[PDB]
Amino acid sequence: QNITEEFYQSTCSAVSRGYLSALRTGWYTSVVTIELSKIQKNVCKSTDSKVKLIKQELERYNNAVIELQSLMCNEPASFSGSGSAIASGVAVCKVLHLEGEVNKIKNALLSTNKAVVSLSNGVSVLTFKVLDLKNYIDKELLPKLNNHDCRISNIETVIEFQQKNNRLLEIAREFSVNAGITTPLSTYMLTNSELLSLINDMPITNDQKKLMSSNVQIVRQQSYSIMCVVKEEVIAYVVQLPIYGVIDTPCWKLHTSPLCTTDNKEGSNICLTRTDRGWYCDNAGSVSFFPQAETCKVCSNRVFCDTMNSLTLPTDVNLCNTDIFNTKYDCKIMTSKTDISSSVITSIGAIVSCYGKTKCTASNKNRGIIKTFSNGCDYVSNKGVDTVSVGNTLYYVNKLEGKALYIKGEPIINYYDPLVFPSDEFDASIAQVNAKINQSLAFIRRSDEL
Amino acid sequence: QNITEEFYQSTCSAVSRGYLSALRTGWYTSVVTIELSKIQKNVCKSTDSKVKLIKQELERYNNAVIELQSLMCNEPASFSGSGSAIASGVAVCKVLHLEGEVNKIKNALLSTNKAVVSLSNGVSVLTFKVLDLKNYIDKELLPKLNNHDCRISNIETVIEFQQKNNRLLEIAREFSVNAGITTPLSTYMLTNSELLSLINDMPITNDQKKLMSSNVQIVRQQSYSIMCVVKEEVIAYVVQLPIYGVIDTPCWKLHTSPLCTTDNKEGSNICLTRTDRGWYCDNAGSVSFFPQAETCKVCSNRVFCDTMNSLTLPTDVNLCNTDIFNTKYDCKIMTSKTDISSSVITSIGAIVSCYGKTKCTASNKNRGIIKTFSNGCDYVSNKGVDTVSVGNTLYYVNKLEGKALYIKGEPIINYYDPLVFPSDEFDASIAQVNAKINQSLAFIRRSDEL
Amino acid sequence: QNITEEFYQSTCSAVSRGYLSALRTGWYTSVVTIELSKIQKNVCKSTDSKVKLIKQELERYNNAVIELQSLMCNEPASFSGSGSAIASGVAVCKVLHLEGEVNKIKNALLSTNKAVVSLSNGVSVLTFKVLDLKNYIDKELLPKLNNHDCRISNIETVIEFQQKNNRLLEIAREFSVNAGITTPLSTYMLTNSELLSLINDMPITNDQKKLMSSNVQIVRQQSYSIMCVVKEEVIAYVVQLPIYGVIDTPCWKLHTSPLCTTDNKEGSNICLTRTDRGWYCDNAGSVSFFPQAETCKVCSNRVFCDTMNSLTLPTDVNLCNTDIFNTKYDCKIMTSKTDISSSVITSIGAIVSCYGKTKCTASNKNRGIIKTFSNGCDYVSNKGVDTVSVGNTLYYVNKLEGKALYIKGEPIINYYDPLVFPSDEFDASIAQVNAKINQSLAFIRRSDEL
Ligand SMILES: *[C@@H]1O[C@H](CO)[C@@H](O)[C@H](O)[C@H]1NC(C)=O
Ligand SMILES: *[C@@H]1O[C@H](CO)[C@@H](O)[C@H](O)[C@H]1NC(C)=O
Ligand SMILES: *[C@@H]1O[C@H](CO)[C@@H](O)[C@H](O)[C@H]1NC(C)=O
C-alpha cells in the first residue's frame, strides 16, 4: 500500500511502483535587484587604522562591480543550441538592455522591497531587493567620511561593513567562474528565508506551494540564475524557478539486466536486454519517459524531473513489463553474444545476472552469505539482505522496506535459435529481430530443397 | 549581413552561419609566487583578547600551508593518458622541484612584484607575487609580538590580518578538493584586476589582447591552475592561459534531426540522420570540427573552442550541407526504423521531426499556437515564434533575430526502398549503405531468374 | 625497474606497466557531531554597536540550522538505483531517526571529543565533535547577555564569534546546494588536521594508514558526507571513508588506436580497434578492469580506483596484449571502414594512427619536427620528444621518463579480406567476426560452383 516492486523472470527486468510525480512544466521568471551608491575615487588619504580598513573592504566592493559589467556578453544573443531552458529568463535579460525599463523598476523598490512591475514586453515579473548598500553607504558611510573632514565613526562599522559586503563578494566570485549562469541556485544568490517568500507568491495552487516549501533543496537543484546588465547604480540579474504542473500522477522506474543462455559452449550463448531503462510517469494520457535518470531527483515518495529531457510515449507502452510480445507496441531490446556477469540494484531489491564461473552471491549483515546465485538472471528481495557480490564487485542494497513480488516466467531468450540469432543489435526491437530471423532463415528455407 | 541560417529540407538539417572563430592554439604558462615568513611555535601565552584572536587567525595560516605540501604527489609523474593539456605547465612544476631554480626566482620579486626569469630548462616564464605576507608578518606582526614583550598593537591588525589571510585560506580550501589542479581559474587564484595585467604582456598581437580583455570570463573557462611545490618560504604554483592562434575565420554549427517516411504501416517506415553534428571552423585550409559542443563556448559573435577535442577534416566537407550525394567526400549518416518524434532548437529557429500521432506544434507568446506540424521533418524561423511543443515536451527558441532561409528539397529518405534498407547502422555513410544495398540486392538480382 | 611500457605493432595498442594498486574495498562509516545551544528570540533590544553586530552574526546562526532541518527528505528512503555507495552511511542516517540513539551519543562527547558508541543496530561507529558552540554560547555568550542586563563584553567576542561561526555557515551553504550529500569531502566538513586523526584509528593495518596519510587529497576524492537529522541541540551527519583492501598488486593501463589499411581506394580500406581500454589490476587471481578511467586516480606510482565501477575478468585476459588470436579468451574488437587519423597519448609515449593526406608529426622542444609519420599506426617513445601534431590538433606528451619497448609485428588488419569484412561492428570479437566471415563466405562457397 506504500512502495511495491515486481520482478519479471521472463524478461530479466524489474519495475518499482508506488512513486508520485512532480514534473517541471514552466519557468517562473523573476528579477532581483541591488541598489548601489557609485562614488568615484575621492578618498581622503587620512591613513588611520580605522580608515585603511574601510579602503580595503571597499576596494573589494569595486572589484565586485566592474567584474559583473564585463560579463555582459552572456547572454544577449549567444548559447546556440542546447541549454534552451534559460531562454525564458534570457527574454528578461534582453528587456534590461532597454532604457527606461531599468528606471521603471527602481520605483516600487525604494518603498516596499518587493512589487510586480509592468515592462516594455509587459511580462508580469516580480522584483526583489535582497541587499541594500546605497542606503548603507550614502547614509552611513558617505556623510561621516566625505564632508565631515574624514571622520571614521568606530570599528563596529568595519566589521558590519565586512558582513554587509561579504554577500556581494561571493556572488561576483561565483558569477565570474560560471560565465553568468549558475546552478543550482546557491544560498548566496538566494537564502532560505527569501526563497520561501517567493514561492508563496507564485501563480500556482496552494498545493504546489506546500511541495516547494517542505522540499526546498530540490527546487534549488532545478533552478538557474542569469546575469543581465549593471547600470544606473543597480545590479540586475534573473533567477528562474520551476513551475511544477504535472503533479501527483503515478511513476515507476524500470530496471534491466542482461538475460543469456547457459546451454552452449563458451561464447555460443545468446543474450538480450530491454533497452529503455529509467523513469516513467503519466503526463496527460501519454507516458513521459526520462532516459538519463540524471535529470530526475527522488525525495522520499516524490520524483522531480524536467520534461525537457524526456521522450513522450503512448500509454500502450506498459505492455513491455508483462506481455513483451504484444502486437500493439513494439518493445525495444538489444542483443549480443557478450556473456558477462553483472548486478543491478533496484529500489527494494537487486537483480543478478550470473554467467560463467563468476562468483555471484548475496550476503547478510550478521551471518554472511545467504544465497549463492546459479547461472542465469535472478532476483532477491531486500528483506534481511544487505550486500551482493559479483566477482570482485560488491554492491549495497537500499534498505528501504517494501513488498517485493516475484513473477516467475520462461526466460524469452530460450524461444530463440542460436544459429539465426543476430550477432549484435544496438537498439533493435522484437519486430526488427523477428524480421532479421525471417531474413536469415529466408535463405535456408528456399535453398536447401535441392 | 550579421547572423544567417539555412534549413535543408532534403537532408532534415540546418546550418547556422555568420560566426567568427577563436580557437585555443597554445598554452601561455606562468607561475605566481607567495612570499612566506615561516616561524615556529614560539608563542608567548599572554592569553589576552587581542592575542588569542591572532592565534586563531594564524593557526589557519598553519593549516593552509602544510596542507599544500601534502599535495606534492600531483603531478610530478602521474596523470596517465587524458588531461594532457596541463603538460605544458607540468613541465614547469617539474622545474620547481630543482634546487637553485627556486632561489633564482625569489630574486626579481622582492623589488618589482613581476619579472621574467631564466630557468634551468630556460623557458621564458613570467612571475607574479599577488599576496605578500612575509612583508606583513616579519615587519608588522613579528617585531611587535616576538621581542617587544608580547605587545599586540590594537584590533585593526586583527581585522586586517583576517582579510590579508582570507585569500590564502580559500585557496588551500580549493586545491585540497581539486587534487592540485583547478578549473576554471577562480578569482581567488587570480582576481580580475590581476588577470587583465597578464594578458597585456603575452607574446601575442594587440588583437588577441583586446579579445581576452573584453571577454575575460571565457578566458577563465579554458584556463588551469596547477600546484607544484612549497619550499623555502615560497608557495609555487603554475597557471596556464589559452593562446588563441586561429582567430577570425568563419564558423558554423550543424543541426540535425531524424528524417523518416510516412507511407508505411507502424514500424515499416525507414529513417536516417546526419551524424557529425556540432561546430565547424576553418583552420588553415582544412576544417576543424568539434563533435562535443561542450568544449566550445559562444559569446555573441565569437566562438571559443579547444582544438584538442577536435577532428581535423578536409575542406571538401561542406558538400554534405547541399549535395550530400557527392563523389568527393563520403557523408556520414545513421539509419534506423525507430520512428520517434523530436525537436531540435537551433540558433534562430527550430527543427521539428513529427511522426505518428504525436502532437507537434509551435506557439506564440501572445496568441498561442500558430502552426500545427504535419508528419515529417519541418522547420520554422523564430520571427514572432517563442515556444515549440512536441508531445509532452516544450522547448523555448532563442529569440536572437536573424535572416533564416528555407531551402526546399526532396527528402532523400524517399529515394530508398524499404525492403533492402539497413535495419540499423550506427555510424555508416552514403557509400556504405549503397554498398549494403548492392549486397542485399545482389542476392535477389542473381537468384530469382530460375 | 620502475615504469615501463611496450607497444604492439600487430594490434596498434600499447600497455603501460609498473603501477601499483590501491582499490576501494570497504566504507569506513563515521559520524561527526556539533553541540548546540538552542535559544529562542529573547533578545534584549539594547541597540548598541556591540549588540547589533552579534544580532547579525547570530541570525546567520539561525539560518544555518533551520536550513539543515528542511534537508531531511535526503535520504531516509530515496535514491532509487545508482549511487548505492552511500548506502553504508545511509544505514547510519536511518539509525539517527531513532529516539534514545541520539541521546546515547551525546554521552561520551562532553568529556573527550571522541569515542566509539554502541547503537541500536550496534554498528561500531566512531564519533567526533569538531566544533562546540553550546559551550561557547551558553557559557560565554548567554550569561553576559541574557541575565546580566544586556552586557556585551567587548569587540573581540564579535570577531571570535565570527570565526567560531564561520565554519557552520559554509557547511549549510554547501549542503543546501548538494541535497545533503557532498563529494569530495571538503575541508569545511573535515580539515586536514582532523582527517589524519581518524585514519590512524581505522580497523586497518599500519600499511594502509601510511598510504592515506601521505596521500590525503586522494582519500578526499573518494569520500562522501551525508546529512541525517538535526534534533536535541545536536547536528548529526555521516561521512564515509574508503577502506582500501586490494593493495600493492600490479596494475597496467591499456591504450588503443584505430588500425587501418593503406592499400585501397578512398573508403575501400578496413579498420579495427581493441575495445576494452583502460585500467586493469589484479584482485585475487581474477583481473579487475575499470572501463571509465574517470573512476581511477593516479598518484605517482599509486592507482586508486573504486571497485564498484569495475568489470571482473579472468586472469587469461592478458593474452590480448600479445597473442590476440588465442583459443582460451576471445578478445573484443570493433570494426569500421571509417578512416580518420588520430593520436593517443600514453604514459611515456604516444600512438599515432596516420591515414590519408593527414599531416601527422612529432616535434621537439628545441629543434622542431623530428619524425614525420607515414600512413599507418605508429608509436614513438617520449625520450627527447615533447609534442605531436595530427592535422590541426596538437598534443603534449607526458615527460615522465621510462623505458619504452617497441614490439614489431604484422598488423592484423592485413590478415583480412576487404570484400567479406564487416561494414561496422560496435563491440564484436575475434570469434564473432570470423563467424560473420564464415557466414558471408558461406554463400560464395556454396553457390558459385554452378
Ligand atoms: C515470418 O514469416 C512467416 C511466414 O513463413 C509469417 O507467418 C510470420 O508472420 C513472419 N514473421 C514476421 C515477424 O514477419
Ligand atoms: C551497384 O552496382 C551497380 C551495378 O549493377 C553499379 O552500377 C553501381 O555503381 C553500384 N553502386 C555502388 C554504390 O557500388
Ligand atoms: C570456418 O569454417 C571452416 C570450415 O570451412 C572451419 O575449419 C573454421 O574453423 C571455421 N572458423 C570459425 C571461426 O568458425
The residue to which cell 566544533 is assigned: C131
Q: What is the DSSP string of B343-368?
A: EEE-SSEEEEEE-SS--EEEEETTTE
Position C200 in a domain: no
Q: Cell match 560565465: residue?
A: A179
Q: Are residues B257 and B333 in the same domain?
A: yes
CB atoms within 10 A of CB C335: 21
Residue B104 C-alpha cell reads as: 633564482
Q: Say if residue A75 is preceded by a cis peptide, omega within 30 of 0.
A: yes
Candidates A52, A176, A427; nearest CB to B187: A176
User: Are C275 and C335 within one domain?
Assistant: yes
Please enumerate, as own/partner, the contacts of C402-405 that have beta carbons within 8 Å and a separation of 24 or more. C402/C2, C402/C3, C402/C4, C402/C5, C402/C18, C402/C347, C402/C348, C403/C3, C403/C4, C403/C5, C404/C4, C404/C5, C404/C6, C404/C7, C404/C348, C404/C349, C405/C4, C405/C5, C405/C6, C405/C7
Pair C171, C64: CB distance under 8 Å:
yes
Which residue has cell 601534502? B70
Residue A210 lies in a domain: no
Sign of the torsion formed by the C-alpha atoms of B427, B433, B435 and B441 = positive
Q: Is residue B29 part of a domain?
A: no
Name the residue with cell 529466408. A442
- Enter the C-alpha cell of residue A216: 526546498
DSSP state of B186: -
| Residue A359 to residues A203, A350, B343, C165, C420, Cα–Cα distance (Å) | 57, 16, 46, 51, 39
Of the candidates A187, A255, A300, which has its C-beta nearest C176's C-beta? Answer: A187
In whole angstroms, give the CA distance from residue C243 to residue A286: 47
Residue C80 C-alpha from the chain's centroid: 21
Look at residues C366, C360, C214 and name the one whose alpha carbon lies nearest to residue C300.
Answer: C214
For chain B, the straight-line distance linking the first and the last C-alpha, in angstroms and rounded, comes to 64
Distance CA A376, CA A355 (A): 6
The full DSSP string for C87-117 is HHHHHHHTTTTSTTHHHHHHGGGTTTSEEEE
Query: What CA–CA distance (Å, rounded) separates B62 from B57?
Result: 9
Identify the residue whose C-alpha is closest to ligand 3 atom 3. Answer: C438
Are the beta carbons of C398 and B77 separated by less than 8 Å?
A: yes
The rounded distance, in Å, linking the Cα atoms of B219 and B30 is 15
The reply to whether residue A81 touches residue B346, judged by beta carbons under 8 angstroms, is yes
Contact B393 A307 (CB under 8 A): yes
> Is there a cis peptide before residue C75, judged by omega within 30 degrees of 0?
yes
From residue A333, how far is each of A438, B87, B289, B338 by CA, in Å? Answer: 17, 44, 33, 12
Tell me the chain B residues in contact with residue C345 when contact means C-beta distances shorter than 8 Å.
81-82, 84
CB A64 within 8 A of CB A172: yes
Pairing type for strands A114-117 and A125-132 reads: antiparallel
Q: Are strands C349-354 and C4-8 parallel, antiparallel or unpaired?
A: unpaired
How far apart CA A262 and CA C351 sit, in angstroms, is 40
d(CA A434, CA A424): 14
SS3 labels along B88-108? HHHHHHCCCCCCCHHHHHHHH
Count CB neighbours of C99 within 10 A: 9
Do C378 and C317 share a structural domain? Answer: yes
Distance of CA A49 to the CA centre of its chain: 49
> What backbone torsions phi and psi does residue A327 show, to the nearest 5 degrees?
-85, -15
| Alpha-carbon torsion (C180, C182, C187, C190), positive or negative | positive
Cα A93 to Cα A228: distance, rounded to the nearest angstrom: 5
Dist CA C30 CA C115 (whole Å)? 11
Size of interface A-B (CB pairs under 8 A): 148
Closest listed residue to residue A16, CA positions, set A186, A257, A252: A252
Q: Which amino acid is at B74?
A: N
Same domain, A8 and A107: no
Label residues C280-301 b or e (16+ Cβ within 10 Å = b): bbbbeebbbbbeebebbbbbbe
Within a domain: residue A240?
no
| Spatial separation of the C-alpha atoms in residues B370 and B381, rounded to whole Å | 12
What does the angle CA C38 – CA C41 – CA C47 come to, to the nearest 5 degrees? 125
3-state secondary structure of B300: coil
| Closest C-alpha to C390, from C350, C348, C351, C341 | C341
Residue A299 and residue A228 share a domain: no
Resolution of the deposited coordinates, in angstroms?
Answer: 3.5
Strands annotated E in C176-233: 181-182, 225-231
C-alpha cell at B125: 616564464
CA A309 to chain centre: 10
CA distance A287 to A249: 10
Please tell me the total number of residues recorded for chain C in this structure.
Answer: 450
Distance CA B312, CA B287 (A): 6
Q: What is d(CA A229, CA A99) in angstroms, rounded to the nearest whole number? A: 12
User: Are C397 and B351 within 8 A, CB to CB?
Assistant: no
Count the alpha carbons within 13 Å of A25 in the hemisphere toward its beta carbon.
14
- Element spanning A115, H or E: strand A114-117
Residue with grid cell 562535443, as numbered in its chain: B292
Distance CA A310, CA A293 (A): 10
* Rounded CA separation B84/B90 (Å): 10
- Residue at B106 is within a domain: yes
The answer to whether A19 and A301 have CB atoms below 8 angstroms apart is yes
Please give the Cα distance from A281 to A312 (Å, whole number): 10
Same-domain pairing of A305 and A403: yes
Residue B228 lies in a domain: yes
Q: Most distant CA pair in chain B: distance in Å?
A: 115
Strand duo B114-117 + B125-132: pairing: antiparallel
SS3 B388: strand
CA–CA separation, B351 and B14 (whole Å): 8
Same domain, A8 and A111: no
Overall size of chain B counted in residues: 450
Cell numbers given for C245: 583492501
How many domains is chain C partitioned into structurally? 2
Relative orientation angle of helices C192-199 and C206-214, to the nearest 10 degrees: 170
A116 lies in the same domain as A11: no
**C57 upstream amide cis, omega within 30 of 0:** no
Give CA–CA dist B9/B321, Å, rounded.
Answer: 11
Pocket test for ligand 2, best of B326, B420, B436, B438 (most atoms within 8 A of CB): B438
For residue C52, the enclosing domain spans 37-184+222-232
For cell 532463415, what's the residue?
A441
Contacts of B242 (CB under 8 A, 6+ apart): B24, B25, B26, B27, B28, B219, B222, B223, B306
Q: How far apart are CA C418 and CA B340, in angstroms?
A: 35
Whether the CB-CB separation of A273 and A339 falls below 8 Å is answered with no
**Residue C405, CA distances (Å) to C298, C408, C411 in order:** 22, 10, 17
Which residue has its alpha carbon closest to ligand 3 atom 1?
Answer: C438
**Which chain C residues are Cβ-neighbours of B429 within 8 angstroms?**
267, 337-338
The answer to whether A119 touches A255, Cβ cutoff 8 Å, is no
> Do B46 and B116 fall into the same domain?
yes
CA distances from C72 to A178, B140, C69 (A): 29, 48, 6
Residue C419 burial (10 A CB sphere; 0-12, 13-18, 19+): exposed
| A106 DSSP assignment | H
Question: Do residue B64 and residue B111 come from a single domain?
Answer: yes
What the block records as the C-alpha cell of B30 is 606562468
Quickly list DSSP for B117-177.
Answer: E--SS---EEEEEEEE-HHHIIIIIHHHHHTTTS----SHHHHHHHHHHHHHHHHHHHHTT
* C116 vs C107: CA distance, rounded Å: 11
Quote the DSSP letter at residue B48: -
Task: Output the CA angle B73-B78-B81, nearest 5 degrees.
Answer: 155
**Dist. CA A155–CA C406, nearest whole Å:** 71
Q: Residue B109 half-sphere exposure, CB side, CA atoms within 13 Å?
A: 24
Q: How far is B381 from B394, CA to CA, in rounded Å?
A: 17
Residue B137: CB atoms within 10 A of its CB come to 22
H or E segment and range at residue B50: helix B49-70
- A424·C429 Cβ contact <8 A: no
Q: Tell whether C57 and C152 lie within a shared domain.
A: yes
Instruction: Collapse the DSSP code of B415 into the 3-class scheme (helix H, G, I; strand E, B; otherwise coil) and give the result.
Output: coil
Residue C121 lies in a domain: yes
Strand partners, A422: none
Cα of C267 vs centre of ligand 3, distance in Å, is: 28
DSSP code for A235: E
User: Are C411 and C9 in contact, with CB atoms under 8 Å apart?
Assistant: yes
Contact criterion met (CB < 8 Å) for C179 and A221:
yes
Give the number of the atom of ligand 2 that is nearest the alpha carbon of residue B431. Answer: 13
Is residue A114, in this structure, part of any structural domain at all? yes
Does residue C253 share a domain with residue C228? no
Residue C337 Cα to ligand 3 midpoint, Å, equals 24
Contact status, residue B40 vs residue B65, Cβ threshold 8 Å: no
Structural element, H or E, at residue B296: none
- Give one DSSP letter per residue of A147-196, joined into a string: TTTS----SHHHHHHHHHHHHHHHHHHHHTTTTTEESS--TTTS-HHHHH
User: Which residues, including other chains, have CB under 8 Å from residue A9's CB and lie 6 or more apart?
Assistant: A377, A379, A406, A407, A408, A409, A410, A411
